[PDB]
Amino acid sequence: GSHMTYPKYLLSPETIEALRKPTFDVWLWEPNEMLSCLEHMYHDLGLVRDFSINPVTLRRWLFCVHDNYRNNPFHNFRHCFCVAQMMYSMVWLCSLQEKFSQTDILILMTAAICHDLDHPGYNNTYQINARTELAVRYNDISPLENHHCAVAFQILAEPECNIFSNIPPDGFKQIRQGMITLILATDMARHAEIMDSFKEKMENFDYSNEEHMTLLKMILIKCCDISNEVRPMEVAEPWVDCLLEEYFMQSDREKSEGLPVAPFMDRDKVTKATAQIGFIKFVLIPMFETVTKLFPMVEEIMLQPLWESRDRYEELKRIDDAMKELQK
Numbered sequence: 001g002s003h004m005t006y007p008k009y010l011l012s013p014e015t016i017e018a019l020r021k022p023t024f025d026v027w028l029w030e031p032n033e034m035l036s037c038l039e040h041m042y043h044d045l046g047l048v049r050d051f052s053i054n055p056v057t058l059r060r061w062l063f064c065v066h067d068n069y070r071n072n073p074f075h076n077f078r079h080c081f082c083v084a085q086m087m088y089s090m091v092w093l094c095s096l097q098e099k100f101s102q103t104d105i106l107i108l109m110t111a112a113i114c115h116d117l118d119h120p121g122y123n124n125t126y127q128i129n130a131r132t133e134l135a136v137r138y139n140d141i142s143p144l145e146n147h148h149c150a151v152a153f154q155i156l157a158e159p160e161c162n163i164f165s166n167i168p169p170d171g172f173k174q175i176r177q178g179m180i181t182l183i184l185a186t187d188m189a190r191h192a193e194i195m196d197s198f199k200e201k202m203e204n205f206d207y208s209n210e211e212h213m214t215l216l217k218m219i220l221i222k223c224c225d226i227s228n229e230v231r232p233m234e235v236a237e238p239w240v241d242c243l244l245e246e247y248f249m250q251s252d253r254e255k256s257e258g259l260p261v262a263p264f265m266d267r268d269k270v271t272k273a274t275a276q277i278g279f280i281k282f283v284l285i286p287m288f289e290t291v292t293k294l295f296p297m298v299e300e301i302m303l304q305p306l307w308e309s310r311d312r313y314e315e316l317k318r319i320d321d322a323m324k325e326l327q328k
């Protein structure tokens, strides 16, 4: 509702406001618009101010991150934007600036943005089983996540992209360690371990305990990474097809190459509805349930849409199953 028309990469006041909430429609925007959103987040969170980030370096860095995301069906730049935009939403929803230092917020946001850089479109189990150059490089230890992190810091070592160039060395070392911990924590193999450790701390949680706070930040980046189904159905739904497209590409390849296949990626065994019912019930709901014990406001904003998505997928499954009753 402005008196003239602006270029798309100039975010409207309504977009800037919408960006603060998990209802934001991530599909609406092209890459250069998404880049403008991410830029706005760094200014709006006070990170440009508190870390003396050169504003032009911020943009060059974002452009370079974008260029180093691959065009996978799921693990692409739009996914990175989702994860970061959910993290941003969490900052406001949970009032994280009351609990976390600016350095922690910087770690959270930058890790979120960087956490899937240069993803090859085939997961760690493929890397390991196929004995790829990556699996060999990283000795079968979270090869993809180690790689994402190493690319992150290769980008940040280019002077014209170094958004940390005005932070003193000790600050840099603190941010580097935090980002490594958080990006490595996104390896889903470690999900049960990290949830257990967190739940231990949750027996008597202490915001001034640095170990407690490291685990909270790992849980937060983990929430955001797998958060799609928290979004409105019409935003969330198209992601599932993207996920399955990547899964099926891998499992087709594994069958062909003579490698082991996960039943959860097998296009013979797997459907949209079956994929999501399990993940929502047994991974997402329980995770957000534990978060909701620190941040009660999470139940209404995030657990509700998950209960809704679960129920809807259970309905879809009934129809899918009937439809297969017709095809023998």
Ligand SMILES: Nc1nc2c(ncn2[C@@H]2O[C@@H]3COP(=O)(O)O[C@H]3[C@H]2O)c(=O)[nH]1
Binding pocket: 123, 186, 187, 188, 225, 226, 227, 228, 229, 240, 243, 275, 276, 279
């Ligand atoms: N079934 C399902 N899995 C998801 C969804 N979102 C993300 N994931 C999984 O969670 C994993 C997070 O780590 P990965 O990036 O390796 O791969 C991701 C997917 O396998 C989802 O909506 N449904």
Ligand SMILES: [Mg+2]
Binding pocket: 115, 116, 144, 145, 186, 187
């Ligand atoms: Mg990942």
Ligand SMILES: [Zn+2]
Binding pocket: 079, 083, 115, 116, 225
């Ligand atoms: Zn991811």
